Nucleic acid binder design. Structure first.
Lengths: 96, 190, 114, 179
RNA sequence: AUUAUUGCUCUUCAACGAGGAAUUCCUAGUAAGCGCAAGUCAUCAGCUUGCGUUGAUUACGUCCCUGCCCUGUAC
RNA sequence: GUUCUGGGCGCACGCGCGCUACACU
RNA sequence: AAGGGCACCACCAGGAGUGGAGCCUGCGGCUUAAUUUGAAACUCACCAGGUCCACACAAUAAGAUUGACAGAUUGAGAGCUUUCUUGAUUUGUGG
């Protein structure tokens, strides 16, 4: 018996980087409103190739954003972010 | 030079405003106001903090120091505006008079400013914001620097304000003169 | 009453465009002398039809032609003027004569350094 | 002078094409008078528009300047590749196969230009009665594009293999074994 | 040509009294003063390079400061 | 992908290269 | 694995200056739909909003399809109304 055995439901959102500059990259489809990009701005980004990064700011009305990473990215990489939710056990009943 | 970031860690943990950028400078950078000094010797900051703390432990019109570590200092943010753009204060005669009496106090505390001039006075109605390269009253040129301050403040009141127990007209004597705490912080001259 | 450079409002509306250009300052006179393009003609065509069918106001017609001079033929019409993004709705009062349409639709927001 | 119509050729792709140029093919002397339009000043969009309007003497136009503009466009382009509208015009050519081969084929016989041209010639079907003649002319590495023209899957074609019997030359020879 | 390319005419007449702490370039037809030509370019420089005109004061030294280059014991 | 119309390349403030002056040489 | 040399991007003796005022302009920051990384169109790479565009099986056609007068529709338009013309490539499911 251990109530401290916390379970967290992880979620991964993903989007496509599509334009590339010497200091920033911009990414599509991960969000569709400027308000959403702003609300989730603080969560760190990572590539599945293993680089980290962060949101700079909203770009335009369609929810594009531009971001900075540890190094060179390319369209063969994908950009992701992780989120976590608490879960709780369900009760149980006898069987016969 | 990652210490330029990691040095925060003591202050970051011991200190709650995020603050904002105010200005880059040559010797130090300034950002509820934080001052960051500029690899080793700057941990100068202790000299500044103790000096300001002493003067604010006295009754002088100086900002209250709060905290200091790892070449980082935090101070009261100033409400006023820089005196060099003042043009129309409602009581210039008392302002002149009492800026003079401020010098007398420093001399009685054995200290003289190097540049008690409009670049470091902000708007008694005023506060004195820094003390670069201060000297003792005992220094060989103390009177020479002393009289420079008196004439510097007199020139300003003449040129812009046209002004020209207390000092000035309405008091027995026009302006103080050199012949009429250094050992704790021996900045120069014992 | 309103008057324009001494010409009274009631003689306006009767005045043709090629008459009106003789009153205007140098910028307008050069623009017409250099030959204004055909593009207003389609706009003018539509604007007349809306006014003629109107029951009372003619309701907006909308355009990108920000570089178009206000001319007495169009007094009283209601127009939606493009803004690079949105449309702004304006009614052509007589005081607007000789201005450009672009002056009535602000391409940029204020800024306040909040 | 026709330059009163020819001066518009630098921008005719922005919209409806001038009738003074679009009517020009109606004149039988236009095969010589068309040079009076300054065609080398024509924008590629008009060349594509002219290619659609140019539809055996039409091979005298297709090979008389069209293939020259194609080689000039790929050779003069800073990336070494044909422009989209020239490429779209090239793929929009070939409406008569004997004109494509008789004009654009045999006279085209560097390797970077041959590969780009082949990437269009594979983009559409062709009649087998024409392809048999194409193999005979290809049976004459700049000829290695015949290893793509045979990839579409005659007794003279069997004989051409007997007369013809890099990795693309071996690979093309292997594809010629697929029956 | 509106949120205004440039030119011309009349009217309006702001700060600024030789500028704190700091700090840049330079030994002779050189510094500094003054102007022209080219560049880009439909139009549009208070920019860049080159050219000419007028033409000084102060050294002809040092390792004090800053920085560079040679040849084991309190660190 | 191709192409067309309109907009953009604003200023609480910090740092830097410049232009014009404070007059009687 | 402490001495010596040298340099007005070092000093000394000086000159002309910057830093103080107004304006032009580069960067950071702020704002915004975007203020992209000798800019009024294009340039242009940014924003809002419009058109237009492998093969194997099963269906389908000597009319698969192609093109052209006059006129049309939107905030941005051209052989859709009209009706001639040409002759072997179209619609689904698995690169």
């Amino acid at each position: 018996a251990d109530h401290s055995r916390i379970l967290a439901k992880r979620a991964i959102l993903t989007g496509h980087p599509f334009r590339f500059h010497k200091t920033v990259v911009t990414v599509r489809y991960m969000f569709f409103r400027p308000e959403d990009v702003e609300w989730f701005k603080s969560i760190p980004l990572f590539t599945k190739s293993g680089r980290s990064g962060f949101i700079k700011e909203s770009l335009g009305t369609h929810g594009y954003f531009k971001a900075t990473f540890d190094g060179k990215l390319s369209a063969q990489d994908v950009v992701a972010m992780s989120l976590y939710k608490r879960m709780w056990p369900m009760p149980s009943l006898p069987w016969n | 030079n990652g210490i330029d970031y990691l040095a925060l860690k003591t202050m970051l943990n011991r200190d709650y405003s995020v603050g904002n950028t105010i200005g880059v400078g040559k010797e130090s950078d300034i950002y509820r106001v934080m001052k960051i000094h500029r690899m080793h010797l700057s941990r100068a900051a202790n000299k500044e903090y103790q000096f300001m703390s002493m003067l604010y432990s006295k009754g002088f019109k100086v900002p209250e120091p709060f905290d200091n570590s790892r070449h980082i200092v935090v101070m009261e943010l100033i409400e006023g505006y820089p005196m060099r753009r003042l043009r129309k204060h409602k009581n210039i005669p008392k302002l002149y008079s009492d800026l003079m009496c401020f010098i007398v106090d420093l001399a009685n505390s054995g200290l003289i400013h190097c540049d008690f001039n409009e670049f470091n006075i902000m708007i008694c109605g005023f506060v004195v914001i820094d003390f670069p390269q201060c000297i003792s009253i005992q220094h060989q040129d103390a009177d020479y620097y002393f009289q420079r301050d008196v004439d510097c403040i007199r020139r300003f009141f003449k040129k812009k304000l046209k002004y020209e127990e207390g000092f000035g007209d309405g008091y027995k004597y026009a302006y103080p003169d050199f012949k009429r705490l250094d050992e704790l912080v021996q900045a120069s001259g014992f | 009453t309103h008057s324009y450079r001494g010409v009274d409002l009631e003689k306006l509306l009767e005045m043709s465009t090629e008459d009106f250009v003789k009153l205007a300052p140098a910028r307008v006179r050069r623009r017409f002398a250099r030959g204004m393009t055909s593009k207003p003609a389609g706009f003018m065509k539509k604007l007349r039809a809306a006014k003629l069918a109107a029951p009372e106001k003619p309701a907006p017609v909308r355009t990108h032609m920000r570089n178009m001079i206000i001319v007495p033929e169009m007094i009283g019409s209601v127009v939606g003027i493009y803004n690079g993004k949105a449309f702004n709705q304006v009614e052509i009062r007589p005081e607007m004569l000789g201005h450009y349409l672009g002056e009535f639709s602000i391409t940029y927001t204020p800024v306040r350094h909040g | 002078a026709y330059t009163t119509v020819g001066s518009i050729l630098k921008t005719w792709t922005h919209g409806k094409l001038p009738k003074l140029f679009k009517v020009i093919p109606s004149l039988r002397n236009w095969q010589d008078v068309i040079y009076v339009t300054n065609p080398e000043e024509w924008s590629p969009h008009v060349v594509y528009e002219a290619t659609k309007l140019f539809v055996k003497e039409s091979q005298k136009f297709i090979n008389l300047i069209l293939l020259e503009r194609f080689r000039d466009n790929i050779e003069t382009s800073e990336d070494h590749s044909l422009n989209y509208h020239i490429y779209r015009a090239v793929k929009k050519s070939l409406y008569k196969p004997s004109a494509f081969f008789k004009g654009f084929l045999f006279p085209l016989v560097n390797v970077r230009e041959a590969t780009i041209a082949g990437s269009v010639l594979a983009k559409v079907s062709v009649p087998a009665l024409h392809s048999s003649a194409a193999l005979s002319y290809l049976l004459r590495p700049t000829t290695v594009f015949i290893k793509i023209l045979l990839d579409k899957k005659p007794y003279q074609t069997v004989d051409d293999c007997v007369y013809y019997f890099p990795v693309i030359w071996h690979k093309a020879f292997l594809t010629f074994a697929q029956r």
